[PDB]
C-alpha cells in the first residue's frame, strides 16, 4: 500500500496537531478571559457552558498529546513492522487506541482517513470489519476518559470555576450540595 | 461591570466636586459683594432673590460636602463590598442617600450617570426599578434638608440679610412681622 503517502500524512497530522494545539491554546486563553467576563457578568451558568466547552477542549488536548505520542512511536517502527505482516504487542495498545479513536478523529483530520485505511490495509489478523473491532479492545482507557463525553462532577466543575475565580479573581459560590459532593 | 471606569469616574467626581466648590466659592464672593450692591442700591428684594439663589447654592455646597464624604467612604470599601454581592448596612445610608440624590445629581455630573448604573448593576437585592426605590428610603434626612428646595423662613432670610448687612455694612430693615416671626 501507499505507505509513504501514509507517512507524509502522519507528518501532516503531527504538524496540524501542533498547529491546532497552539491555535486552540491561544483562543482558549482569550476564552478564559471571556469566561472571566461571563462569570463576572451575571450568568455564571453561561460561563458554566463555556467552560464545559473548554474542559471538553482540554480533554481533546490531552487526548491529542497521547495520540501524538502514539503516532510518533508507530512512526519509529515504520520499516520494522512493515517487514512484519501482523501487528505486534509492543504496538497493540497504540494501534487499538488509534483504531478506536480514529472514527472519533475521522472528522478532525482527513489524513487519518488514509491512515486508518492503510492500517486496515496493513493487517487482517485481528484486522478488518470485526477482526479490527476485535483487536481494538486494547484501547487506552486513560485516553478513553480523555475521550469520554460526559459532564464532569459538579464538585469538579465547581472546582474549575473556583480555580478560575482564583486565577481570574471573580467571586464564585459553588452550589453547596455540589460543593460538598 | 466596569468598576474601574466607575472608580476613575468617582475620582473625577471628587475632582470636579473640589473644582466646582472652589469656583462657586469664588463667584459667590463676587456675588456677595454684588448683593451688597443691590441691597445698598434700592431693590433689596432683587438682592433677596439673589441671596435666595445663593442660599440655594449653599444648600448645594453642604450637600456636596456630605456626598463627597459618602463617595469617599464607599471608595474605601471598594474591593471589600465588591467581594460581597449585596449592599451592607454600613453603607446602606450612604447608598440610599446617593441613589436618592443621584437623579437630582444626574444633571450636575455625567460620571455619576455611570456611577448610578454600576450601583444598580452592582445589586438587585433592594436594587432595581422599585427594589432600588425600596432600599433608597434610608436617604440622609439632613442632606434631604440640604437638598430640599424651599424658601427659608423669612426670619432666617431676614437674618441672612441682617448678617450680610452686618458683614457688608448696608442698612437692612427686616419686615417686622417676619423679623418677629
Swiss-Prot record, chains A, B:
* Assigned GO CC terms: azurophil granule lumen; centrosome; chromatin; cytosol; endoplasmic reticulum-Golgi intermediate compartment; extracellular exosome; extracellular region; Flemming body
Q: Which UniProt keywords apply?
A: Cell cycle, Cell division, Cytoplasm, Cytoplasmic vesicle, Cytoskeleton, Nucleus, Phosphoprotein
GO molecular function per UniProt: cadherin binding; identical protein binding; MIT domain binding; protein domain specific binding; protein-containing complex binding
**Which cellular compartments is it found in?**
Cytoplasmic vesicle; Cytoplasm, Cytoskeleton, Microtubule organizing center, Centrosome; Midbody; Nucleus envelope
In terms of superkingdom, the source organism counts as Eukaryota
- Main subcellular localisation: cytoplasm
Q: Which GO terms describe its biological process?
A: cell division; collateral sprouting; cytoskeleton-dependent cytokinesis; ESCRT III complex disassembly; establishment of protein localization; midbody abscission; multivesicular body assembly; positive regulation of collateral sprouting
Stretches the record annotates as Interaction with CHMP1A and CHMP1B: 1-163
Q: List the disulfide bonds.
A: none
Q: Which residues carry this modification: Phosphotyrosine?
A: 38
Subunit: Interacts with CHMP1A, CHMP1B, VPS4A and VTA1. Interacts with SPAST, STAMBP, and USP8. May interact with VPS37B. May associate with the ESCRT-I complex. Interacts with MITD1, in competition with VSP4. Interacts with SPART (via MIT domain); leading to the recruitment of SPART to midbodies. Interacts with SPAST.
Family stated for the protein in its record: Belongs to the IST1 family.
This molecule's function is given as: ESCRT-III-like protein involved in cytokinesis, nuclear envelope reassembly and endosomal tubulation. Is required for efficient abscission during cytokinesis. Involved in recruiting VPS4A and/or VPS4B to the midbody of dividing cells. During late anaphase, involved in nuclear envelope reassembly and mitotic spindle disassembly together with the ESCRT-III complex: IST1 acts by mediating the recruitment of SPAST to the nuclear membrane, leading to microtubule severing. Recruited to the reforming nuclear envelope (NE) during anaphase by LEMD2.
Q: What is this protein called?
A: IST1 homolog
In which organism is this protein found? Homo sapiens (Human)
Q: What part of the entire protein does this chain span?
A: 6 to 186 of 364
Amino acid at each position: 500500500f501507499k505507505a509513504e503517502r501514509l507517512r507524509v500524512n502522519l507528518e501532516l497530522v503531527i504538524n496540524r496537531l501542533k498547529l491546532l494545539e497552539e491555535k486552540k491554546t491561544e483562543l482558549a486563553q482569550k476564552a478564559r478571559k471571556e469566561i472571566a467576563d461571563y462569570l463576572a457578568a451575571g450568568k455564571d451558568e453561561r460561563a458554566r457552558i463555556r467552560v464545559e466547552h473548554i474542559i471538553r477542549e482540554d480533554y481533546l488536548v490531552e487526548a491529542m498529546e497521547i495520540l501524538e505520542l502514539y503516532c510518533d512511536l508507530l512512526l519509529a517502527r515504520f520499516g520494522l513492522i512493515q517487514s512484519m505482516k501482523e501487528l505486534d504487542s509492543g504496538l497493540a495498545e497504540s494501534v487499538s487506541t488509534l483504531i478506536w479513536a480514529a472514527p472519533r478523529l475521522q472528522s478532525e483530520v482527513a489524513e487519518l482517513k488514509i491512515v486508518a485505511d492503510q492500517l486496515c490495509a496493513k493487517y487482517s489478523k485481528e484486522y478488518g470489519k470485526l477482526c479490527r473491532t476485535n483487536q481494538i479492545g486494547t484501547v487506552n482507557d486513560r485516553l478513553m476518559h480523555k475521550l469520554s463525553v460526559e459532564a464532569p462532577p459538579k464538585i469538579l466543575v465547581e472546582r474549575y470555576l473556583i480555580e478560575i475565580a482564583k486565577n481570574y479573581n471573580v467571586p464564585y459560590e459553588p452550589d453547596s450540595v455540589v460543593m460538598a459532593e
